[PDB]
């Protein structure tokens, strides 16, 4: 029968990221934009994230992104 497919970012979650301006204040940090840009070019996304769960700047911006997409 039917199954879940929720491992893709939705149009409503995309809208809530781009229209939230408090998120943009966190992304304007030059240390965040460099690590976000290097992340997508990496071949091991899970291995890259496991280096940033330990970082107090990258954890705080991730926590705000992860709140914004859960607050649908």
């Amino acid at each position: 029968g039917p199954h879940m497919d929720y491992d893709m970012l939705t149009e409503e979650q995309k809208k809530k990221l781009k229209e939230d301006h408090t998120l943009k204040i966190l992304l304007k940090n030059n240390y965040v934009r460099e690590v976000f840009k290097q992340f997508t070019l990496s071949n091991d996304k899970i291995g890259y994230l496991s280096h940033y769960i330990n970082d107090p700047t990258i954890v705080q911006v991730i926590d705000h992104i992860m709140k914004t997409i859960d607050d649908t």
């Binding site: 970012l9 990221l17 781009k18 943009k24 992304l27 992340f39 899970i46």
Partner: peptide
């Protein structure tokens, strides 16, 4: 668990970077 949380996180990184949220130019 971390592995279910990361799948939503990484598709947010890949959207934010493609639309260049931090770059006004």
């Amino acid at each position: 668990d971390i592995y279910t949380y990361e799948k939503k996180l990484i598709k947010s990184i890949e959207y934010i970077t493609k639309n260049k949220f931090f770059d006004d130019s």
